[PDB]
């Protein structure tokens, strides 16, 4: 049997958020000049001439 009062509820939610799927598009990124590129040992790679 349909009880109007007892069937009523209050549903909560957040107000006005925005969902961003991609997450790295906001990142801009650049490389040092690859001649002066360095490894884990803090010592240059491609240096012998």
């Amino acid at each position: 049997q349909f009880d109007f009062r007892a069937s009523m509820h209050m549903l909560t939610s957040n107000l006005t958020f925005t969902v961003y799927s991609d997450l790295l598009a906001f990142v801009s990124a650049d490389t040092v000049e690859p001649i002066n590129a360095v490894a884990f040992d803090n010592m240059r790679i491609m240096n012998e001439l």
Binding site: A25, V27, S28, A29, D30
Partner: protein
Amino acid sequence: KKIQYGAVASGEKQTKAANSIANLALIKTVLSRISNKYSFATKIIRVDGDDNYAVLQFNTEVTKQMVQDVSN
């Protein structure tokens, strides 16, 4: 008829390399104005007389609006 034409064309020993030079200077001169609105590193320009293409690399990823605005 004889028409005033104080400019360049072929029929000369000079035309190919000189046109390549002038287009190189032109594109180098133009390309120092896109820098007022974009950050890029010019990797390559190529000129063979009356044609030209320049590749350029950015600090970020490319969009449709940046290509359009660069073209304009």
